[PDB]
Symmetry: C3
Subunit: 263 residues, 3 copies
Amino acid sequence: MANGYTYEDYQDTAKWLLSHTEQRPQVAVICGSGLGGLVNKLTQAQTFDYSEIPNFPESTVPGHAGRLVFGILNGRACVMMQGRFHMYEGYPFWKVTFPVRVFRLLGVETLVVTNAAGGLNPNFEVGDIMLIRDHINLPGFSGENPLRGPNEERFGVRFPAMSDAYDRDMRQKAHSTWKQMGEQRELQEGTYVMLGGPNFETVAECRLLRNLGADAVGMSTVPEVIVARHCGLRVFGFSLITNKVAAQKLEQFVSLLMASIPV
Amino acid sequence: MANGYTYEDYQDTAKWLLSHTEQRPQVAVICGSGLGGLVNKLTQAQTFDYSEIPNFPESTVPGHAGRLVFGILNGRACVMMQGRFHMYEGYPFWKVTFPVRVFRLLGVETLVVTNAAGGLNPNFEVGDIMLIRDHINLPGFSGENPLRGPNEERFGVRFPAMSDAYDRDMRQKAHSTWKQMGEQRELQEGTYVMLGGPNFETVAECRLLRNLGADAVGMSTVPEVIVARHCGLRVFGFSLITNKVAAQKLEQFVSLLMASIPV
Amino acid sequence: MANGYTYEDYQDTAKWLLSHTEQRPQVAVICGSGLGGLVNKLTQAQTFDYSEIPNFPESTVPGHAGRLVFGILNGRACVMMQGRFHMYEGYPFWKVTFPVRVFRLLGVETLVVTNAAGGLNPNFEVGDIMLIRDHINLPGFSGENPLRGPNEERFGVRFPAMSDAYDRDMRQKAHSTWKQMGEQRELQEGTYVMLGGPNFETVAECRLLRNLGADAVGMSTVPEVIVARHCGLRVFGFSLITNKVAAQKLEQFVSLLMASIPV
Ligand SMILES: [Mg+2]
Ligand SMILES: [Mg+2]
Ligand SMILES: [Mg+2]
């Protein structure tokens, strides 16, 4: 589906935000299912319901508060999406990813994505935290892509590379930080595969996905990462393994990682 | 694509049907390609062309009569779709699956799906009947799903499970019944994979599908099963292997199975 | 997505072309990325910008000139698409494939497709030329197909076969011709897989594709081949391996092949 937002639309929203808060975050965090508590660590917090922000889509899924919260996390200025958007809600990817481009226009340089996923790797257990090393974009194979349509050169190039999407340096930082935390369970890492949803997978589908090389499965994140890389944002993320085919722990982990982010 | 039918639309159609026949079926059967003769076993039959039923889509494929027939099959009150709808016809899944929700609103509790499929399992031969044990929804991987869009809580939940889609008890019943039939060829069973169509598969595609764990391939059924499970219908079905990459026999088989359906 | 062009639309465009040139090509060639120089071998050339041809879509990708050139190539009357259309540009397949049906209505009998692709087969090296033996249509698995919607019987059948898409005889001709050329590097051949794009693949995606049996990957061609076969055109093509996950050479090769095309 071709994008319906104009560059000016993104700019209008960014301007509105800049004129409503003194906060100037360099980092943006998208909180997935059951990860909304991450905004509780914020100091000097300022909240905006998605409904009050011009052009913003709305979270219709339970567990997704639908609020944009600016604040200081571990001495770092951040902006968090307390809840996100999903294709299964009826949103084309250009709407699901709208905030990512707005963040770039606010001066954000790093995007942290989080989600709740089903574990396909047999070595994963419920409660595991998997650093996303790579992804498999199934909807993208059929053309469902947030970048579909005329390319906005002011954001990025026509054919963006995706092989280096998840920042290697941050991957290293995450592991070092996990060790400083003294966690008994090792920090997992792997490939996240996105499918449309909303129904849960069949066994045949799960076997298929695992054999495709996927370690975790979900219905989000990938489109946001694609748009982030297209506009030049540094990206890193984690999947909270909510079941085998921790949230508070991940929030703590992300808070410590703020200190490791460059700039 | 987001659903265009409102709950009331389904209700209007169900009401129209209830006011045009005294029949009150507990079972619904969708007859796929070359399986239209199944309506010939019906007693006290009452037919409605899809064109005369408010809100109903139309069968444009040859071999699909495009008629809804109520009647008694093996002493069981049934409603049969003599012909179905397919995505390749240009129908979004919310239109392809419209009748399933109407059946639920008529008081139907069990849905039997049938189709003609190409055999991927090398042990299948033309004329084989494969009980559907599981499915692989390729269109669903890219987001093409009848459940896409706002969830209608009056039908079902936001994230329905699909791993237990094909009723285990009916699976057992089917096998016992097949044995009572004294059939020389064993009743096959496996995973059905759906793809969009309308063109037939290439060899490379067939090898791919088989290696994905699929036993049979077609361009229908899966969306109907997803909608059925979402609204709570018991589901079971069969693929008539029309070629290696029986109709009358399957009709007889389905007639006997009526006695095995609960309620 | 259902086709938006009527049979008459294709006919109008074909009529316009026939009334603007004396050229009556029996062969059509679609020049992919970096293959636009092929029109330089044409004698008695007549060019039409896509923008001046009624109903024609427009090439928005760099390297795609967006011109239709009629001319004589190796004593053979040809019509070449100097640049093509892609789904990632925002075009549904029925627009991407519009020219193919116009060519059929001009009296064209053979379609030669070319593209630039990434090599998945580990035995391929940059600069390799891969004769397309078969394809894997990922978008087609989810229903994204140029044939989706009501079937135009005046073009072809409802369920066209695709297993024999790439003409075997031309495959043989290509190899014989390559040998006459005295090329030191062997002519490769294999399966081309199409995905939507526009972003480049991740490593996980590349491993997946290779394991699916694909030898080369790109974001075009497959839809054109499907439409060509549907309307009865003889089809053959090549992928120029532009990188491992020659243009002038391929142009020379295609020029020699004109003599091998039947009729
Ligand atoms: Mg404040
Ligand atoms: Mg009667
Ligand atoms: Mg001239």
